[PDB]
Design a binder for this molecule. Sequence first.
Ligand SMILES: Nc1nc2c(ncn2[C@@H]2O[C@H](COP(=O)(O)OP(=O)(O)O)[C@@H](O)[C@H]2O)c(=O)[nH]1
Lengths: 58, 338, 339
Amino acid sequence: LTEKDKLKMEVDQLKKEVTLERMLVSKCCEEFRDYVEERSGEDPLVKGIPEDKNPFKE
Amino acid sequence: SAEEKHSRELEKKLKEDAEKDARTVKLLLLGAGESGKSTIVKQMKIIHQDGYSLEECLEFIAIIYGNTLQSILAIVRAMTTLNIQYGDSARQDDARKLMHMADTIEEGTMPKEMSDIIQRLWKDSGIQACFDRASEYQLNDSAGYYLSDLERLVTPGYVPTEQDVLRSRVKTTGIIETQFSFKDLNFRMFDVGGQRSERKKWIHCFEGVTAIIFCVALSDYDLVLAEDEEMNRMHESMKLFDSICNNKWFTDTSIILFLNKKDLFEEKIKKSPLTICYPEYAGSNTYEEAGNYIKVQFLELNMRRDVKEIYSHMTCATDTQNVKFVFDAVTDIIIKEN
Amino acid sequence: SELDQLRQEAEQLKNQIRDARKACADATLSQITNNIDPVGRIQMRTRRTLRGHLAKIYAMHWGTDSRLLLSASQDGKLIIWDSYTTNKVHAIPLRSSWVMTCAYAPSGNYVACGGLDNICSIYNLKTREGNVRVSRELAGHTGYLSCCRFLDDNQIVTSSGDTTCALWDIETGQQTTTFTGHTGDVMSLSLAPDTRLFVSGACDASAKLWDVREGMCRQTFTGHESDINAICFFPNGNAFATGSDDATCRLFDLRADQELMTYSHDNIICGITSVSFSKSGRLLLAGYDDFNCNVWDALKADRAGVLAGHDNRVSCLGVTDDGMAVATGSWDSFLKIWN
Ligand SMILES: Nc1nc2c(ncn2[C@@H]2O[C@H](COP(=O)(O)OP(=O)(O)O)[C@@H](O)[C@H]2O)c(=O)[nH]1
């Protein structure tokens, strides 16, 4: 019990995770990159904000 | 503006809270389980907040019955584990019945048939011999208290007294805080209670408290952990103190040591050798020497740069006058130091 | 033996997970993004300093309108501010002052919070002004409430020091699902944009992905050296970032089942308390024990800027839904809005 049962469940989770169908890093990365690149040009924290469009101006 | 006005409204209230907080004494209670923290909190209500209402005392009956049943079952199960024979064979049938009833009746109830069995068991010499060997198993501190006065507890019209309430033990989770006025100041005393998690993640929350009252159960010197029957309770308490006292968040914090359960200790010291806890102990197993030795063992754990004194007090948390007295002394130093 | 043979099968299954991980590790994000131009030195200015709390701020959360936000302080107050005007909308006195987290309901109808009281309290904003009506107290955890996030007006997920997370039916106050698996206090959690999955970070130095409907753990992410105190989903729901006591933040991809990048610097040695991505996900902002918020280039791992202004730990931070601002909360009792 406890120690064994926490562990029995540990190994029980690994077995499930070991059957994980992993994708290629590069594909993941490329899709990550493309997502950001498509919108970083309109990101207020990347580009800054023209004072007149800034709601947090004095 | 309406919004602006409302904001000004909230601010004037926030201003009050700040003024009040400035005149508030914050006390953090710490110590191992069963050291006396909840009891100290109950005493603050009795001493500084007009005690318990009729209905509140009545709400404690179920807890008191739970505690009482729990206590006798512990002694009963220990009869087998310690291989102790009953004084009278007939008690065997009582024990068997009591155990069936225990997991048959509603939690917190005490039927006449149950109390009758319990009073009979309490009177048995085997049970009494087992009770005296409580150190060898896990038994509530109030076992004798409630069991010795069981008739009163079950007499119709029964209303728990403050001592009955003080002697109770309830399982709860979450921090408990009590607030009151005393000596023309506001006080906020808190006990983290049932906190199942790692202390390192929350201990910083108490940086800056006015003082820490660390409770130690003097009588734990020969007891072990329920969850770990290899860990001496006093050693565990010492590790806790070492960890707290030398913690980076309390380098200059006022710490007071409550060497609690001095009443149980005074009786136990005549039965159990302190060497059970400190093998190297060469003093006399007397309330004076032994209690002073325990006190020194804890004080010596203080490795803080700020050598401000850590005051010690021998206390009986269940004794309202003792607590009222110690707390009066404690508060004086605090006010005249912070 | 039983225990040992279990200790064995577990480790064997672990060294088996990594190899599978390597098998998909054909490149690195920094390689894939090397042809990208740096964002330059990010220089945000303090646009507002929200003053009102009497003590350390432990948490904050932006309202979906990117204007109202709520903050939690151990002064026992939950304040709702109009960041534009700085006007205080509410100042709710909590039953327990030992709060560690707060959330703003997407609808803006409720806020929630909790702490050492091990309860997640729900307040109805569309009722009382200044103070407000406590509408529910969700009891069930046995360790502190570290984080909570509403999925909608009747559902909320919570993380706790008791090593579990839970989904609650607010109208009932019942726990519809419990998430078990972490072996250390759960410090933070983040819901996927579609609210059908969520990730949690814990003191077991791991992150776990959870199915909200099926209540089980899909994946567990390792790599950090110490406790993960903060976690946040990336905008496209395919990855998330973590912040840890090990002085590093990390980017993990769900599909690749592993980290894509670590964000650190030899001169940054303290622990991280919070993390958040900017709107596009180009920047990863994190709060640190050393009093600053460091802005990182998510794609290139470069430290692009710093938000220095607080005189004590930055305990929490958040970027508005419209991406126009970042708010930082601190132990110094103040919140600042940077642009
Ligand atoms: N006889 C006696 N009982 C005490 C004393 N202090 C506490 N108790 C009892 O010991 C038990 C545990 O104390 P409690 O305050 O619940 O410990 P906590 O676990 O630290 O909150 C309770 O049944 C108390 O009533 C004391 O000085 N003497």
